[PDB]
Amino acid sequence: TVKIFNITDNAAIKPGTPLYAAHFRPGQYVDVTAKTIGKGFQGVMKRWGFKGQPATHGQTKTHRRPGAVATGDIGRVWPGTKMPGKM
Amino acid sequence: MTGKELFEMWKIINPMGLLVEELKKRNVSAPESRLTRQSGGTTALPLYFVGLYCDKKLIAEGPGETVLVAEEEAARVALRKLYGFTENRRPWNY
Amino acid sequence: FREVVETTIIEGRITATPKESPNPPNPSGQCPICRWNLKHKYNYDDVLLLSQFIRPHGGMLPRKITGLCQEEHRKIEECVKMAHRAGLLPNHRPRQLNRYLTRWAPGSVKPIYKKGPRWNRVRMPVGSPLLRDNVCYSRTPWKLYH
Amino acid sequence: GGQWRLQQGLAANPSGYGPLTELPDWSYADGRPAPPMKG
Amino acid sequence: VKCTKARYLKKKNMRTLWINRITAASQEHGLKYPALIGNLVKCQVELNRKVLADLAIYEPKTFKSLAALASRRRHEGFAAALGDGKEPEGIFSRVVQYH
Amino acid sequence: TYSPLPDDYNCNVELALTSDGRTIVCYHPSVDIPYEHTKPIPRDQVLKTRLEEKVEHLEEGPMIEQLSKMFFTTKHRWYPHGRYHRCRKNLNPPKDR
Amino acid sequence: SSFSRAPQQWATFARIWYLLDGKMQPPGKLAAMASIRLQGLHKPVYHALSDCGDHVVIMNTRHIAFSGNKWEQKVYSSHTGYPGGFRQVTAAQLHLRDPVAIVKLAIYGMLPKNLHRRTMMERLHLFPDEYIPEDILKNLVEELPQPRKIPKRLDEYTQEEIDAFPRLWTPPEDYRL
Amino acid sequence: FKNKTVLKKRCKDCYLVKRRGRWYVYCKTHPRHKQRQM
Amino acid sequence: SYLPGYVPKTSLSSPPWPEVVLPDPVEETRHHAEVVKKVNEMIVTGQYGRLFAVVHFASRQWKVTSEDLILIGNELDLACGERIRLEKVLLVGADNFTLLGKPLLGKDLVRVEATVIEKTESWPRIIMRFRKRKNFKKKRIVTTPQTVLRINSIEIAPCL
Ligand SMILES: [Mg+2]
Ligand SMILES: [Mg+2]
Ligand SMILES: [Mg+2]
Ligand SMILES: [Zn+2]
Ligand SMILES: [Zn+2]
């Protein structure tokens, strides 16, 4: 992996140079960026934490589904609606 | 031969050469090429209007996409004007 | 004019005063505007006339001293406000968005978030209804609302 | 220019009773007058 | 049905194109289209919009002649309006009479 | 000293009326571009001067953005067309003058 | 003109690069003449299928002027189509973000609403300041005249103009001013 | 302040000022007399 | 001394358009005479070529030149191959001069000669009426007769 770091002009270091872990010191604060653990295609309960439907009390094949996705006046679903997908 | 032009009927190669020979044999100075008008130039679709001058007097002007083809078209215009076969010339009397 | 200085010692002196140009074209007029035949022939651009009728610090002189009638005085006042907002008086200052024909003070108008239907449209005012009566020189009158 | 033409008496339409609309369109090349137009 | 009604639309659109091109050429000469048209009609020159656009494209010097003529007629009309009396009618504001 | 239009861009329009006043005569010789208004025309030791043939093949995206930037057009002109339209096109169009 | 057919066509349908200045101009007057020149409606050879638009280069778009209180009243609305995407920014805020946005939007609204519009937009070139790239500067022909007339601030008046304008009124000789 | 369509001066010390495009009744001695134009 | 009516230079004191003074009529008339004489000598010498004319014909205006074709949309009671004189000449022009009628040029000044060379029919034009839900459908097919003329000559004579 190559990553691009934004620096000012006084922090220029020659290309081809080695960097080690003592570039950082104890007792400080850092930000760590990484690609998270992929979960595949997940539904709304695991992806978004939706409450879902109860198990018993007459329920037909609906325990883990999104309910209404929008209102009836709009004949569409709003962009950014939380749906199953890649997590 | 009604609706055709001179260099569609009679193909020539060096209109600048023919023009300088005609001007030399009728005793006027050699024509100078100058860039009269110019649009674009750094684009892929320029326009160059190149004029041919003799003793600081305009004898021709011609358009083109490059300076060289504009100069060639101006030479053709000058040849048509000298030879009398111009587009607004008198039509044939039938 | 008259000046006062402080140095405690305060005193005022009378300095040189400009005079009216000798032969007005309409000597029977009442206001200076009516006298010099400018009744509907000036705008906010005419900073020569407005500078004749303002104070050294951008404010305005009153009617009993300018000799102006009330319509003309209110028209000069609006022209002077519009000229100040257009920046046409750089030296008559107190104590970047470019403008002209500015009726209201720029910090007092709220943005028109909801324009109306085109029978009830909220228009933006331009110019001055007091300068509505100026000479048109055109077959279309002044548009006071845009 | 209809109101101007009316002020000059020259109809309002240029295709009304002028020489432009009533003179013959053509004639024979030797000079014989054409048969009259149907309009 | 579209063919039959498009005959009317064809005539209307061609007049619109002629007015557009006359507007363009007149504005190149500094005039406006109402100025050109009205003052040509006042000069008794009865060229229509079709041949006026055709002259705008293929005979620019003839169109500049027409534009200068219309501009001069406009100036004569303005001068007559300011004069308001019985000053002479103007060279190009004379009207040929037919009986 | 009066001119209805400036006489320095196309032709020198001079208007006239005949003595009977029935015809208008326009005299308009062209205006020639002056010399002073023009501008002059702009102007390995051991091996052969080898001709520099490089043609970097570009993908559809970079090629279309290069063409569109060069001609000041959008990408939609450069995207292809299908066989229906390709066979609908008239390849022997009528030609006048 | 006794040209050949291909050079005659090239001369007739060649593109021109017009130059337009900002600096105290109303965006809509700039936009009206820019839309005319971008469509090609200034040519008598105009047709909507003739593709006869030209290039318009507007500079000093940071120094435009709005008449009235349009800087504080006129609102530009957009909607990022997410629930809550509705943004309404004043002309002042839009100008302080993007100094070409106001002129660009005025020209965009005045161009015809067809599939040629974004082509004309890509032949439109806008620059906020006096700086123009060198290729464009070698491309330009005909700086078009400015629609507004620059009302000439008081300190710019010559002393000849100042003393030629008559003094209208006599001030009293005892007033403080 | 209280919103009024008709602004009335309830004292001799009330004064009318047009600020930020609206009329206001201000009273430095009786602050309950403060009025804002609608 | 300011004249009575003197308004000082403000923005609205004077009209925005520049002041225009027209030429004095007698000098202008002599100028018209000299311009017409110059154009007449140009016609006499023959310093022209390739005239065009705007000609009124069959309710329409045609901008014709020599060796031209025009398609008139009605029958013209003339046999094919027949020379006629077009007469209602609104304009005749050339390079360096044009002549304009008010509204028509005199026939002693310009002569347009054309020739009927074809008498034919137009391609079939479909006239269809249809109104929906009211059973309104009619079809008609017409062919308009037509005449193709060739403009032979445009001749001007010294008469100005
Ligand atoms: Mg549960
Ligand atoms: Mg069941
Ligand atoms: Mg179950
Ligand atoms: Zn007064
Ligand atoms: Zn109170």
CB contact under 8 A, I50 and B89: yes
Which residue spans within C54-132 are E strands per DSSP?
98-100
Which run of H or E residues covers position F40? strand F39-40
Quote the domain boundaries for residue B20: 14-88
Q: Report the residue of chain B nearest F39, measured CA to CA.
A: B35
DSSP state of E73: H
Q: Which candidate in C15, C35, C47, C73 is best for mutational testing of the G interface (most G CBs within 10 A)? A: C47
Q: Could you give the C-alpha distances from F8 to F5, F28, G144, in angstroms and in order? A: 9, 12, 18
Q: Any CB–CB contact under 8 A between B55 and chain G?
A: no
Domain spans in chain G, listed from the N-terminal domain onward: 1-177
- Rounded CA-CA distance C127/C142 in Å is 9
**Which two tokens mark B9?**
């009927």
**Which residues are paired to I121 by β-bridges?**
I145
* DSSP per residue, I11-69: TTTS-SSPP--PPPHHHHHHHHHHHHHHHHHHHHHT-----EEEEEETTEEEEEETTEE
Q: Rounded to a whole number, what is the distance in Å from the CA of I57 to chain D's nearest CA?
A: 6
Q: Report the SS3 class of residue G89.
A: strand
CB contact under 8 A, G123 and F74: no
Q: Rounded to a whole number, what is the distance in Å from the CA of G110 to chain F's nearest CA?
A: 19
Q: Which chains reach chain A with 3 or more Cβ–Cβ distances below 8 angstroms?
A: G
Q: How many helices (H) and strands (E) does chain B have?
A: 3, 3
- Rounded CA-CA distance G141/G147 in Å is 18
Instruction: Say whether the A–B interface has 3 or more Cβ pairs within 8 Å.
Output: no
Where chain H is broken, by preceding residue (C–N > 2.5 Å)?
none
What CATH number was assigned to the domain covering residues G1-177?
3.90.1180.10
CB contact under 8 A, F17 and E64: no
Q: Rounded to a whole number, what is the distance in Å from the CA of I146 to chain B's nearest CA?
A: 25
Radius of gyration of chain E (CA): 17
Place of tokens 């009302």: G151
Residue F16 with chain I: CB contacts under 8 Å: 31-32, 35-36, 39
- Rounded CA-CA distance F51/F60 in Å is 27
C72 CB-near residues (< 8 Å, 6+ apart): C31, C33, C34, C39
Q: How many angstroms is the resolution?
A: 3.2
Question: How close is the Cα of C35 to the center of ligand 4, in Å?
Answer: 8
Question: How close is the Cα of C110 to the center of ligand 5, in Å?
Answer: 29
* DSSP per residue, E2-46: HHHHHHHHHHHHHHHHHHHHHHHHHHHTT--HHHHHHHHHHTT--
* Elucidation technique: cryo-EM
- Rounded CA-CA distance I44/I23 in Å is 29
- Nearest-by-Cβ selection for I54 from E44, E51, E90: E51
* Furthest C-alpha separation in chain I: 87
